[PDB]
Each structure stands twice: as C-alpha cells, then as structure tokens.
C-alpha cells in the first residue's frame, strides 16, 4: 500500500500565519503528478508541534480531500500525550485517511511498558493500519526490536515502521523479528538506498517535497532491482539531502521550494525561523543546480 | 528570591483521571510546612505533557492560590510551540505566579536562532522573571553558554537557569559568562551539592516531593557553608535520588508518597504507567527505610 517515495508534506503558511490551503492543495497536486506514491500530512516536516488541534485536523482533511483516492494518505496522529494521540488518530479515520504515523513519545521518556500502553491504547481505538515512527535523534528513547515485535504480534493493526535511526542493521533485525510482511519505510533520505536492500520498500521523505520527480525515479529504480541506476540517483540527490539538514529542514525545504518558483511562503512557526545563513542557502542552491531543478 | 529546596510538584489525579485538587493542596501545605522554599507547578515532574491547556492553567492557578504569598511560585510555562508558551506564561502572570520555568524546545530541534526567537518572544510578552530549563537528556539540543549569556544580556527578565545537565563545569561557565547575579538552580538532585559550591543557590527537585524535610535541611546546610553536614545528608539521600529514576520518576514519586501514607493515588497518564517492577519498588522502600520510614 505504502511503497517508494512518500513526502512528509510541509504545511505552507500565509504571511498572516494562517494555513495557506491553496498552496497546500497545489503542493499535493504537484507531488502526485511528479510520481510521489503516497502522502504524510501533519508529520514532523509538516510542523505538527506548532499546529493547533483544529489546524492539524484541517491539514489531514484537506490532504485526504485533495488525494481523492489517487494515492494513499498516512495521517500524522502521534504526540507524547496518548489521549491527544487517540483523538488525532480517530479524527484521521473518520475523515477517511488510509493509515496513521504514530511517533515514539518525545520529552516525557516512557519505558518499554509505557510504549506498549501508548501504541496499544491507539491500536485499540482505531481500525486503521499504524506505522511506528522510530526517531531517537528527536525522542531520545528508541523502540527496541523486541518491543516492536511484541506490538506487531499483539495488534494485527500495527503493520509497519518509519525508521529514522539511519542504522540499517536495524532494518535486518526488524525484518527477522516482525517478519517480511512488516512494511519498513526509511525515515532517513541519505540511507534510504541501503535501507531498501535490507528489506525496506520505501522512504517517507523530506527531500521529495523539493524534488519529487527524481526521488520517485530513485525509488522506482530500486523496486525494479536496478541498483547501478539507484546509485547514480543517490550520487545526485545526496548533496540536496545533506544541504536541507544544515539548519532545520522545515525552513530549508520552504526556502528551496520558494527558489524553484512554487507558491510556498518562507513563513514557519517559532521556535522554527525563516532566516538561513548565506552559506546554508549557497549549499542548497548548488545542490539544486547539480540535479538541474531550476527552469 | 528562589533558593534552597524547590519541589517540581507532582500533579495527583483521581481514579477517574481528573485532577485531585484536594491532594495537590495537601501536598503544597505539607511541602511548605516541611521547609520547601518555593514551588514549581506543572513542570516535567507535574506531567505537563499529558495536561490539557485548561488543566495546566488550573494547576498553576490552584498552586498560586494555595501558596498565598508564603513561598514564591515558578509556573511551568514552556512547550516546543512558541505561541502556546506565550499563552501559558501570560495565564501564569495574570493568575499571580511569581516566575516562569521555560524548557528549551524538545523534539522539533530548533537551532541557536530558534532559541533566541523562542526565549525572546516569551520575554517580550510578559514582565515576570524567566528561568531557562536546560535538559538535553529530554530535549536532545542543549542551549550553549554563549546563547544563555546573550539572552541574559538582551532581556533583563531572563534571570536564571534550571541546569539538569548534571555536568557542573557548566555552572562555572554560566557564572562567569552570565555573571554572579544570574540565579543558578540544579535540575539534578544527585549533583545538586556540587552545583551549589560551583555557584548555584538551589535545586528544583524531584526528590523534595517525597522527603522535603531532609531536602530542606540538606539545602540549609549548604547555604550556611556547613559542607561536612551537607555531605552526610548527600550520603543519606543519594540512594533515594537514584531509586526514584530506575523507572520514570513520575510513577516512582507517586508510589513512594503512597508508601509514606500520603493521600496521593498511583494514577499517572499514558504514555507513563503506574506499574513498577518488584525490584524497583523494593529499591525505593530500602532507600526510604535508610532515611527512617520503618524506624
């Protein structure tokens, strides 16, 4: 269902700090026409942490409405508050999302038993398939393979992982423990290539926002088992992947999209900021021009 | 204004998962009579993350009304959403809080520029004094000394730091860059002793929830420079400091309180859980008996 290049969609804002609903709809249209296989509205890249409840819900609704069944929609539906996570996840089901992205809780640092309670509580409150977002570089704590396996075995409803660890040995461990049927998607653009060869079938991508075409071609080459051409694409994209993470990728992506002439404002919500260093904008520009993304 | 032993108050909950207002009030009355010099309602130990906006506001209001000027109240008023932080901080100011505990944003990983816009935006929207809560083991990112020094120089209402790093060389770094007048409070019970001799005047404490008398006596000894005695207190408390974070401290503190016979239910909110391993409960019990509970 989820496979190949899946943008973690940005949330474009007007200069008045409202949701730019037109820009968001155009972005999704553009993503679909360029070859993106699926959408993740209101995830990290979509500035979930700085959306109100009603905005989060609006962003998911608008993505499901614009998608019109053409590509599957995996709604962001996970905070460090389980009851808020159930309300976001139920809203996403009732508005017609195809799947849920649920992050390992950040800040409050539950133990193993807490992860079981959190993911269990959510899994029992919806019928939609759930993807575990494992991202220790943001959450500090990391779901171990034993906990992940237990969850897959307990809830038929828990079907996959956004694995943003960048340690692809874990892709082999998760494949063996949870089975080949467990849907592993990369949460790290720079290691997505090696992730797929270890059992991955796709990447929930930051870079696909900026360069959906070539990201779709890269993932298509891998799924056709053409690893020589996948590697040619990696060499082209790797510098854009790295340059979008020099400063917060959310600001970097919006900067890039604006330079390409997409109707996406630079505006981000504090504590994110628009202002990037000249060196940062320089490295992004060079990486865009290496691929050849300017008309 | 803020010195010695300052509990980060737990938020007790009824078996129906409402705020147990009676329990919170008794906990505050008890903390004040046992010698705690100050209160932090709705911090991390107060399960800030699982409180609704309404519930966070009620807990700060109730803490301030109960305290009735007897000890200064420092309201938890910081998320990883800058607009929400401002709202929390303004509610705290209007309901009569004496100061603001503002955490370095977690999960969304702002850069230096992001911190200055976060702490700067909050500083602009209130006249209360602000304490920076630096806790990289929860936030990943650490505010560096140059950033802390810049905020203190730029904004006369950024006055101190809850330093949870446990790396006391930073207390010295902070004292020289931000000056002697910069109010440093430990956010690490286990290293609070060495923090004070490096320049600190206090501890915002997890362990003070459970043993406020001995924690107050411990902080008194250091303020009187009786360091032989402060070390005797360190040796008595250390095993309870460590036993309360084998598992998450929220559960560990509420269990310990129930064991002392306080009117505090074990209830916590997901993703935290009440259930502690037998070995965990036994280590807390033995640490409580070492400070004379059985006796």
Coordinates of C-alpha atoms in Angstrom, one line a residue:
Chain A
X1 CA 0.0 0.0 0.0
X2 CA 2.8 2.4 1.1
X3 CA 6.0 2.0 -1.0
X4 CA 8.6 4.1 -2.9
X5 CA 8.7 8.0 -2.5
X6 CA 6.2 9.4 0.2
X7 CA 6.7 13.1 1.1
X8 CA 6.3 14.2 4.7
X9 CA 4.4 17.2 3.4
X10 CA 5.3 20.7 4.6
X11 CA 2.4 22.9 5.9
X12 CA 2.6 26.2 3.9
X13 CA 1.6 29.3 5.9
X14 CA 0.3 32.7 4.6
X15 CA 2.2 35.9 5.7
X16 CA -0.6 36.2 8.4
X17 CA 0.4 32.8 9.9
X18 CA -2.8 31.1 8.7
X19 CA -2.8 27.7 6.8
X20 CA -2.1 28.5 3.0
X21 CA -4.8 26.0 1.9
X22 CA -4.3 26.8 -1.8
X23 CA -0.5 26.4 -1.6
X24 CA -1.0 23.1 0.3
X25 CA -3.5 21.7 -2.4
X26 CA -1.2 22.8 -5.3
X27 CA 1.8 21.1 -3.5
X28 CA -0.2 17.8 -3.2
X29 CA -1.3 18.0 -6.9
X30 CA 2.3 18.7 -7.9
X31 CA 3.7 15.9 -5.7
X32 CA 1.2 13.4 -7.3
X33 CA 1.8 14.5 -10.9
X34 CA 5.7 14.1 -10.3
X35 CA 5.4 10.5 -9.1
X36 CA 5.0 10.6 -5.2
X37 CA 3.4 7.2 -4.3
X38 CA 1.7 8.5 -1.0
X39 CA 1.3 11.4 1.4
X40 CA 2.0 12.1 5.1
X41 CA 0.2 15.3 6.1
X42 CA 0.8 16.9 9.6
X43 CA 4.1 14.9 10.4
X44 CA 7.4 16.5 11.7
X45 CA 8.2 18.1 8.4
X46 CA 4.6 19.4 8.3
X47 CA 5.2 21.3 11.6
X48 CA 2.8 19.2 13.7
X49 CA 4.3 20.5 17.0
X50 CA 3.2 24.2 16.1
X51 CA -0.3 23.3 14.6
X52 CA -3.4 23.7 16.9
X53 CA -5.6 20.7 17.2
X54 CA -8.2 22.2 14.7
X55 CA -5.4 23.1 12.2
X56 CA -3.8 19.5 12.4
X57 CA -7.3 18.1 11.7
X58 CA -7.8 20.6 8.8
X59 CA -4.4 19.7 7.2
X60 CA -5.3 16.0 7.4
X61 CA -8.9 16.6 6.0
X62 CA -7.6 18.8 3.1
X63 CA -4.9 16.2 2.1
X64 CA -7.5 13.3 2.2
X65 CA -9.9 15.5 0.1
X66 CA -7.2 16.6 -2.5
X67 CA -5.8 13.0 -2.7
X68 CA -9.3 11.8 -3.9
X69 CA -8.2 8.1 -3.6
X70 CA -5.3 8.6 -6.2
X71 CA -2.6 7.9 -3.6
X72 CA -2.9 6.6 0.0
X73 CA -2.7 9.2 2.9
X74 CA -0.8 8.3 6.1
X75 CA -2.1 11.0 8.7
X76 CA 0.3 12.2 11.4
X77 CA -1.5 11.1 14.6
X78 CA 1.0 10.9 17.5
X79 CA 2.2 13.3 20.2
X80 CA 3.8 12.5 23.7
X81 CA 0.1 12.6 25.0
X82 CA -1.7 9.2 24.4
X83 CA -5.3 10.7 24.8
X84 CA -4.4 13.5 22.3
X85 CA -2.9 10.8 20.0
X86 CA -6.2 8.8 20.1
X87 CA -8.3 12.0 19.3
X88 CA -5.9 12.9 16.3
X89 CA -6.0 9.2 15.1
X90 CA -9.8 8.9 15.4
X91 CA -10.3 12.2 13.5
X92 CA -8.0 10.8 10.7
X93 CA -10.1 7.6 10.4
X94 CA -13.4 9.5 10.4
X95 CA -12.2 12.0 7.7
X96 CA -11.0 9.0 5.6
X97 CA -7.2 8.7 6.0
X98 CA -5.7 5.3 4.8
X99 CA -3.1 5.0 7.6
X100 CA -1.6 6.5 10.8
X101 CA 2.0 7.6 11.5
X102 CA 2.4 7.4 15.3
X103 CA 5.8 8.6 16.8
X104 CA 7.5 7.1 19.9
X105 CA 6.7 9.7 22.6
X106 CA 9.3 12.6 22.9
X107 CA 10.2 14.6 26.1
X108 CA 8.5 12.6 28.9
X109 CA 10.5 9.4 28.1
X110 CA 8.2 6.4 28.9
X111 CA 9.9 3.0 29.5
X112 CA 9.1 -0.2 27.5
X113 CA 5.8 -0.7 29.5
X114 CA 4.7 2.9 28.5
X115 CA 5.4 2.3 24.8
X116 CA 3.2 -0.9 25.0
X117 CA 0.4 1.1 26.7
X118 CA 0.7 4.1 24.3
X119 CA 0.8 2.0 21.0
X120 CA -1.8 -0.5 22.4
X121 CA -4.2 2.2 23.5
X122 CA -4.1 3.8 20.0
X123 CA -4.2 0.4 18.1
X124 CA -7.4 -0.5 20.1
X125 CA -9.1 2.9 19.5
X126 CA -9.0 2.8 15.6
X127 CA -9.2 0.1 12.9
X128 CA -6.7 1.9 10.5
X129 CA -3.2 0.5 9.9
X130 CA -0.5 2.2 12.2
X131 CA 3.2 2.9 11.3
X132 CA 5.6 3.3 14.3
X133 CA 7.8 6.4 13.7
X134 CA 11.2 5.5 15.4
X135 CA 13.3 8.7 15.7
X136 CA 15.7 8.6 18.7
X137 CA 17.6 11.8 17.4
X138 CA 14.3 13.7 18.3
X139 CA 12.7 11.5 21.0
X140 CA 16.0 10.4 22.8
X141 CA 14.4 6.9 23.7
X142 CA 14.3 4.3 20.9
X143 CA 11.8 1.5 20.4
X144 CA 14.0 -1.7 20.6
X145 CA 13.3 -4.7 18.2
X146 CA 11.7 -6.9 21.0
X147 CA 9.0 -4.2 21.8
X148 CA 8.4 -3.6 18.1
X149 CA 7.9 -7.4 17.5
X150 CA 5.6 -7.7 20.6
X151 CA 3.4 -4.9 19.2
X152 CA 3.2 -6.4 15.7
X153 CA 2.3 -9.9 17.2
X154 CA -0.3 -8.3 19.6
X155 CA -2.2 -5.8 17.3
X156 CA -2.9 -7.0 13.7
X157 CA -3.4 -3.2 13.2
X158 CA 0.3 -2.3 13.7
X159 CA 1.8 -3.0 10.2
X160 CA 5.0 -1.0 9.7
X161 CA 7.8 1.4 10.7
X162 CA 9.1 4.9 9.6
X163 CA 12.7 4.0 10.7
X164 CA 14.6 7.3 11.0
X165 CA 17.6 5.8 13.0
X166 CA 19.9 5.8 9.9
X167 CA 21.3 2.5 11.3
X168 CA 20.2 0.0 8.6
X169 CA 21.4 -3.1 10.6
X170 CA 18.1 -2.5 12.5
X171 CA 16.2 -3.0 9.2
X172 CA 17.6 -6.6 9.1
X173 CA 16.7 -7.1 12.8
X174 CA 13.2 -5.8 12.4
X175 CA 12.6 -7.9 9.2
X176 CA 13.6 -11.1 11.1
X177 CA 11.7 -10.3 14.4
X178 CA 8.5 -8.9 12.8
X179 CA 8.5 -10.9 9.5
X180 CA 8.9 -10.0 5.8
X181 CA 5.2 -8.8 5.8
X182 CA 6.2 -5.9 8.2
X183 CA 6.3 -2.8 6.0
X184 CA 9.6 -1.0 6.7
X185 CA 9.9 2.6 5.3
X186 CA 13.1 4.8 5.7
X187 CA 12.8 8.0 7.7
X188 CA 16.3 9.0 6.6
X189 CA 16.7 10.1 2.9
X190 CA 20.6 9.7 2.9
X191 CA 20.4 5.9 3.9
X192 CA 17.0 5.1 2.1
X193 CA 19.0 3.2 -0.6
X194 CA 20.8 0.8 1.7
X195 CA 17.5 0.6 3.8
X196 CA 15.5 -0.8 0.9
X197 CA 18.2 -3.5 0.1
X198 CA 18.0 -4.7 3.7
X199 CA 14.2 -5.2 3.3
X200 CA 12.8 -1.6 3.1
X201 CA 10.1 -0.9 0.4
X202 CA 10.1 2.9 0.6
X203 CA 11.0 6.2 2.2
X204 CA 8.9 8.9 4.0
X205 CA 11.0 11.7 2.7
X206 CA 11.9 15.4 3.5
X207 CA 13.7 15.9 0.1
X208 CA 10.7 14.6 -2.0
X209 CA 9.0 18.0 -1.1
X210 CA 11.6 19.8 -3.2
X211 CA 12.5 17.2 -5.8
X212 CA 9.6 14.7 -6.1
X213 CA 10.4 13.6 -9.7
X214 CA 14.0 12.4 -9.1
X215 CA 13.0 11.0 -5.7
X216 CA 10.3 8.9 -7.4
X217 CA 12.8 7.8 -10.1
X218 CA 15.3 6.8 -7.4
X219 CA 12.7 4.6 -5.6
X220 CA 11.4 3.2 -8.9
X221 CA 14.9 2.1 -9.9
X222 CA 15.3 0.2 -6.5
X223 CA 11.9 -1.5 -6.9
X224 CA 12.9 -2.6 -10.4
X225 CA 16.2 -4.1 -8.9
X226 CA 18.4 -1.6 -10.9
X227 CA 20.9 -0.8 -8.1
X228 CA 23.5 0.7 -10.6
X229 CA 20.9 3.4 -11.6
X230 CA 19.7 3.8 -7.9
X231 CA 23.4 4.5 -7.0
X232 CA 23.6 7.1 -9.9
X233 CA 20.5 8.8 -8.4
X234 CA 22.0 8.7 -4.8
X235 CA 25.2 10.5 -6.0
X236 CA 22.9 13.3 -7.5
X237 CA 20.5 13.6 -4.5
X238 CA 22.9 13.0 -1.6
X239 CA 24.1 16.7 -1.6
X240 CA 20.5 18.0 -1.6
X241 CA 19.6 15.6 1.3
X242 CA 22.6 16.8 3.3
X243 CA 22.2 20.6 2.4
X244 CA 18.5 20.5 3.6
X245 CA 19.7 19.4 7.1
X246 CA 22.5 22.1 7.7
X247 CA 19.8 24.1 9.5
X248 CA 16.2 22.9 10.4
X249 CA 15.0 21.1 7.2
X250 CA 11.5 22.7 7.6
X251 CA 13.0 26.2 6.9
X252 CA 15.4 24.7 4.3
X253 CA 12.6 22.9 2.3
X254 CA 10.4 26.1 2.2
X255 CA 13.5 28.2 1.1
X256 CA 14.2 25.6 -1.7
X257 CA 10.5 25.5 -2.9
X258 CA 10.4 29.3 -3.0
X259 CA 13.6 29.5 -5.1
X260 CA 12.1 26.9 -7.6
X261 CA 9.0 29.3 -8.0
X262 CA 6.4 27.1 -6.1
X263 CA 3.7 29.3 -4.4
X264 CA 5.1 28.4 -0.9
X265 CA 5.9 31.3 1.5
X266 CA 9.1 31.2 3.6
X267 CA 6.9 31.5 6.8
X268 CA 7.5 28.9 9.6
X269 CA 6.2 28.9 13.2
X270 CA 8.5 29.7 16.2
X271 CA 10.6 28.1 17.5
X272 CA 11.5 27.5 13.8
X273 CA 12.8 30.6 11.8
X274 CA 12.9 31.5 8.1
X275 CA 16.4 33.2 8.3
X276 CA 19.0 30.8 7.0
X277 CA 22.8 31.7 6.8
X278 CA 24.1 32.7 3.3
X279 CA 26.4 29.5 3.4
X280 CA 23.3 27.4 4.0
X281 CA 21.3 29.0 1.1
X282 CA 24.5 28.6 -1.0
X283 CA 24.9 24.8 -0.4
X284 CA 21.1 24.2 -1.1
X285 CA 21.3 26.3 -4.4
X286 CA 24.5 24.4 -5.6
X287 CA 22.8 21.0 -4.8
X288 CA 19.5 22.1 -6.6
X289 CA 21.7 23.2 -9.7
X290 CA 23.7 19.9 -9.6
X291 CA 20.4 18.0 -10.2
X292 CA 19.2 20.8 -12.5
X293 CA 15.9 21.7 -10.8
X294 CA 15.7 25.4 -11.9
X295 CA 13.7 26.1 -15.2
Chain B
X1 CA 14.0 35.0 45.6
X2 CA 14.4 31.4 44.5
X3 CA 16.9 29.4 46.7
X4 CA 17.4 26.1 48.5
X5 CA 14.8 23.2 48.0
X6 CA 12.0 23.8 45.4
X7 CA 9.9 20.8 44.5
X8 CA 8.8 20.2 40.9
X9 CA 5.3 19.3 42.3
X10 CA 3.7 16.1 41.0
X11 CA 0.1 16.5 39.7
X12 CA -2.0 14.0 41.7
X13 CA -5.0 12.5 39.7
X14 CA -8.3 10.8 40.9
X15 CA -9.1 7.2 39.9
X16 CA -11.5 8.9 37.3
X17 CA -8.3 10.6 35.9
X18 CA -9.4 14.2 36.9
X19 CA -7.0 16.5 38.9
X20 CA -7.2 15.6 42.6
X21 CA -7.3 19.2 43.7
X22 CA -7.7 18.3 47.5
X23 CA -4.5 16.1 47.2
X24 CA -2.4 18.8 45.3
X25 CA -3.4 21.3 48.0
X26 CA -2.4 19.0 50.9
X27 CA 0.9 18.2 49.0
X28 CA 1.6 22.0 48.8
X29 CA 0.6 22.7 52.5
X30 CA 2.9 19.8 53.5
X31 CA 5.8 20.9 51.2
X32 CA 5.6 24.5 52.8
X33 CA 5.5 23.3 56.5
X34 CA 8.4 20.7 55.9
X35 CA 10.6 23.7 54.8
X36 CA 10.5 23.8 50.9
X37 CA 11.4 27.5 49.9
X38 CA 9.4 27.5 46.6
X39 CA 7.0 25.6 44.2
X40 CA 7.1 24.7 40.5
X41 CA 3.6 23.6 39.5
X42 CA 3.1 21.8 36.0
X43 CA 6.8 21.2 35.2
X44 CA 8.1 17.8 33.8
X45 CA 7.5 16.0 37.2
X46 CA 4.0 17.6 37.1
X47 CA 3.2 15.6 33.9
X48 CA 2.9 18.9 31.9
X49 CA 2.9 16.9 28.7
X50 CA -0.4 15.0 29.5
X51 CA -2.3 18.0 30.9
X52 CA -4.7 19.9 28.6
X53 CA -4.1 23.7 28.3
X54 CA -7.2 24.1 30.6
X55 CA -5.7 21.5 33.2
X56 CA -2.2 23.2 33.1
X57 CA -3.8 26.6 33.8
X58 CA -6.0 25.2 36.7
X59 CA -2.9 23.5 38.3
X60 CA -0.8 26.8 38.2
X61 CA -3.9 28.9 39.4
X62 CA -4.5 26.4 42.3
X63 CA -0.8 26.2 43.3
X64 CA -0.7 30.1 43.4
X65 CA -4.0 30.4 45.4
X66 CA -2.8 27.7 47.9
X67 CA 0.7 29.2 48.3
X68 CA -1.0 32.6 49.2
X69 CA 2.4 34.5 49.1
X70 CA 4.0 32.2 51.7
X71 CA 6.7 30.8 49.2
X72 CA 7.3 32.1 45.6
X73 CA 5.6 30.1 42.8
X74 CA 7.5 29.4 39.5
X75 CA 4.9 28.2 36.9
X76 CA 5.9 25.7 34.2
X77 CA 5.1 27.8 31.1
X78 CA 7.1 26.3 28.2
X79 CA 6.4 23.8 25.4
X80 CA 8.1 23.2 22.0
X81 CA 5.4 25.6 20.5
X82 CA 6.3 29.3 21.0
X83 CA 2.7 30.7 20.7
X84 CA 1.4 28.1 23.3
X85 CA 4.4 29.0 25.6
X86 CA 3.4 32.7 25.5
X87 CA -0.2 31.8 26.3
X88 CA 0.8 29.5 29.3
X89 CA 3.2 32.3 30.5
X90 CA 0.6 35.1 30.2
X91 CA -2.0 32.9 32.1
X92 CA 0.6 32.3 34.8
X93 CA 1.3 36.1 35.1
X94 CA -2.4 37.1 35.3
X95 CA -3.2 34.3 37.9
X96 CA -0.4 35.7 40.2
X97 CA 2.6 33.4 39.5
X98 CA 6.0 34.9 40.7
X99 CA 8.2 33.5 37.9
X100 CA 8.3 31.2 34.8
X101 CA 10.1 27.9 34.1
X102 CA 10.7 27.8 30.2
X103 CA 12.2 24.5 28.8
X104 CA 14.5 24.6 25.7
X105 CA 12.1 23.3 23.0
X106 CA 12.1 19.5 22.6
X107 CA 11.5 17.2 19.6
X108 CA 11.4 19.9 16.8
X109 CA 15.2 20.7 17.4
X110 CA 15.4 24.5 16.8
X111 CA 18.9 25.9 16.1
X112 CA 20.5 28.8 18.1
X113 CA 18.4 31.4 16.1
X114 CA 15.3 29.4 17.1
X115 CA 16.2 29.5 20.8
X116 CA 16.7 33.3 20.7
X117 CA 13.3 33.7 18.9
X118 CA 11.6 31.3 21.4
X119 CA 13.1 32.8 24.7
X120 CA 13.0 36.4 23.1
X121 CA 9.3 36.1 22.1
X122 CA 8.3 34.9 25.6
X123 CA 10.5 37.5 27.3
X124 CA 8.7 40.3 25.2
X125 CA 5.1 39.1 26.1
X126 CA 5.4 39.0 30.0
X127 CA 7.1 41.1 32.8
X128 CA 7.6 38.0 35.1
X129 CA 11.2 36.8 35.6
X130 CA 12.1 33.7 33.4
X131 CA 14.3 30.7 34.3
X132 CA 15.7 28.7 31.3
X133 CA 15.2 24.9 31.8
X134 CA 18.2 23.2 30.0
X135 CA 17.6 19.4 29.9
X136 CA 19.4 17.9 26.8
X137 CA 18.7 14.3 28.1
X138 CA 14.9 15.1 27.3
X139 CA 15.2 17.9 24.6
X140 CA 18.4 16.4 22.7
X141 CA 19.5 20.0 21.9
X142 CA 21.5 21.9 24.7
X143 CA 21.5 25.7 25.0
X144 CA 25.2 26.6 25.0
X145 CA 26.7 29.2 27.4
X146 CA 27.1 31.9 24.6
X147 CA 23.3 31.7 23.9
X148 CA 22.4 31.8 27.6
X149 CA 24.8 34.8 28.1
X150 CA 23.2 36.5 25.1
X151 CA 19.5 36.1 26.4
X152 CA 20.6 37.3 29.9
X153 CA 22.4 40.5 28.5
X154 CA 19.5 41.1 25.9
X155 CA 16.5 40.6 28.3
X156 CA 16.6 41.9 32.0
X157 CA 13.6 39.4 32.8
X158 CA 15.7 36.3 31.8
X159 CA 17.3 35.9 35.3
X160 CA 18.2 32.2 35.9
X161 CA 18.6 28.5 34.8
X162 CA 17.3 25.1 35.9
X163 CA 20.5 23.2 34.8
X164 CA 19.6 19.5 34.5
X165 CA 22.8 18.6 32.6
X166 CA 24.4 17.1 35.7
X167 CA 27.7 18.5 34.3
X168 CA 28.7 21.0 36.9
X169 CA 31.6 22.5 34.9
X170 CA 28.7 24.4 33.1
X171 CA 27.7 26.0 36.4
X172 CA 31.2 27.7 36.5
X173 CA 30.9 28.5 32.7
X174 CA 27.4 30.0 33.3
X175 CA 28.5 32.0 36.5
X176 CA 31.4 33.7 34.5
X177 CA 29.5 34.4 31.2
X178 CA 26.1 35.4 32.8
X179 CA 27.6 36.9 36.0
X180 CA 27.3 36.2 39.8
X181 CA 23.8 37.8 39.8
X182 CA 22.5 35.0 37.4
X183 CA 20.4 32.7 39.6
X184 CA 21.5 29.1 39.0
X185 CA 19.3 26.2 40.3
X186 CA 20.2 22.5 39.9
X187 CA 17.8 20.2 37.9
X188 CA 19.7 17.1 39.0
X189 CA 19.1 16.0 42.7
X190 CA 22.2 13.7 42.6
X191 CA 24.7 16.5 41.7
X192 CA 22.9 19.5 43.4
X193 CA 25.5 19.5 46.2
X194 CA 28.5 20.2 43.8
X195 CA 26.3 22.5 41.7
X196 CA 25.9 24.9 44.7
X197 CA 29.7 25.0 45.6
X198 CA 30.3 25.9 41.9
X199 CA 27.9 28.9 42.1
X200 CA 24.3 27.5 42.5
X201 CA 21.9 28.8 45.2
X202 CA 19.3 26.0 44.9
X203 CA 17.7 22.8 43.4
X204 CA 14.3 22.4 41.6
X205 CA 13.9 18.9 42.9
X206 CA 12.2 15.6 42.0
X207 CA 13.2 14.1 45.4
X208 CA 11.8 17.0 47.5
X209 CA 8.3 15.7 46.5
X210 CA 9.0 12.6 48.8
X211 CA 11.4 13.8 51.5
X212 CA 11.0 17.6 51.7
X213 CA 12.3 17.9 55.3
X214 CA 15.7 16.2 54.7
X215 CA 16.0 18.1 51.3
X216 CA 15.3 21.4 53.0
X217 CA 17.8 20.5 55.8
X218 CA 20.4 19.5 53.0
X219 CA 20.0 22.8 51.2
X220 CA 20.1 24.8 54.6
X221 CA 23.5 23.2 55.4
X222 CA 25.0 24.3 52.1
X223 CA 23.6 27.9 52.5
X224 CA 25.4 28.0 56.0
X225 CA 28.5 26.6 54.3
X226 CA 28.4 23.5 56.7
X227 CA 29.8 21.2 54.0
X228 CA 30.7 18.3 56.3
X229 CA 27.0 18.1 57.3
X230 CA 25.7 18.6 53.6
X231 CA 27.9 15.6 52.6
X232 CA 26.2 13.5 55.5
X233 CA 22.8 14.5 54.0
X234 CA 24.1 13.6 50.4
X235 CA 25.1 10.1 51.6
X236 CA 21.6 9.6 53.3
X237 CA 19.6 10.9 50.2
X238 CA 21.8 9.6 47.3
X239 CA 20.2 6.1 47.4
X240 CA 16.6 7.7 47.2
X241 CA 17.8 10.1 44.4
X242 CA 18.9 7.1 42.3
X243 CA 16.0 4.7 43.3
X244 CA 13.4 7.3 42.1
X245 CA 14.7 7.2 38.5
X246 CA 15.4 3.4 37.9
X247 CA 11.9 3.8 36.3
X248 CA 10.3 7.1 35.3
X249 CA 10.3 9.5 38.3
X250 CA 6.5 10.5 38.0
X251 CA 5.4 6.9 38.9
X252 CA 8.4 6.4 41.3
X253 CA 7.5 9.6 43.3
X254 CA 3.7 8.8 43.5
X255 CA 4.5 5.2 44.6
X256 CA 7.0 6.5 47.3
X257 CA 4.3 9.0 48.5
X258 CA 1.6 6.3 48.8
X259 CA 4.2 4.2 50.9
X260 CA 4.8 7.2 53.3
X261 CA 1.0 7.1 53.7
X262 CA 0.3 10.5 51.9
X263 CA -3.2 10.9 50.2
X264 CA -1.7 10.6 46.7
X265 CA -3.1 8.0 44.2
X266 CA -0.6 6.0 42.0
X267 CA -2.5 7.1 38.8
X268 CA -0.3 8.6 36.0
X269 CA -1.3 9.4 32.4
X270 CA -0.2 7.4 29.4
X271 CA 2.4 7.1 28.0
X272 CA 3.6 7.0 31.6
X273 CA 2.4 3.8 33.7
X274 CA 1.8 3.1 37.4
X275 CA 3.1 -0.5 37.4
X276 CA 6.7 -0.7 38.7
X277 CA 8.9 -3.8 38.7
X278 CA 9.2 -5.6 42.1
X279 CA 13.0 -4.8 42.2
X280 CA 12.1 -1.0 41.6
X281 CA 9.5 -0.9 44.4
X282 CA 12.0 -2.7 46.7
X283 CA 14.9 -0.2 46.0
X284 CA 12.6 2.8 46.8
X285 CA 11.4 1.1 50.0
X286 CA 15.0 0.3 51.2
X287 CA 16.1 4.0 50.3
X288 CA 13.0 5.3 52.3
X289 CA 13.9 3.0 55.3
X290 CA 17.5 4.3 55.1
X291 CA 16.0 7.8 55.9
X292 CA 13.9 6.1 58.7
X293 CA 10.3 5.1 57.4
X294 CA 10.3 1.6 59.2
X295 CA 12.2 3.3 62.1

